[PDB]
Design a protein around this ligand. Structure first.
Ligand code: NA
Length: 83
């Protein structure tokens, strides 16, 4: 699968948020959020695995810059490519 990185999630974001944002674009096999070891709030980082490259790309192009409540998300693949 293809790994998607989400940044700037708010403190209330959870796995269900990731499923509900990314599932509409295609098959999602895994989601994860990182939480603060001490507060258990979301730290702002999330990860999604999608099976199909073109659906991942559509999710990234659509969701990068998304306003999730009070926060503008950054969504990307790990590194860039010229083709
Ligand atoms: Na904790």
């Amino acid at each position: 699968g293809w790994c998607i990185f989400i940044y700037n999630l708010g403190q209330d974001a959870d796995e269900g948020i990731l499923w509900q944002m990314f599932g509409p674009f295609g098959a999602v096999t895994n989601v994860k959020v990182i939480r603060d070891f001490n507060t258990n709030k979301c730290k702002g980082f999330g990860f999604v695995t999608m099976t199909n490259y073109e659906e991942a790309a559509m999710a990234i192009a659509s969701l990068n810059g998304y306003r999730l409540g009070d926060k503008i998300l950054q969504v990307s693949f790990k590194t860039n490519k010229s083709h």
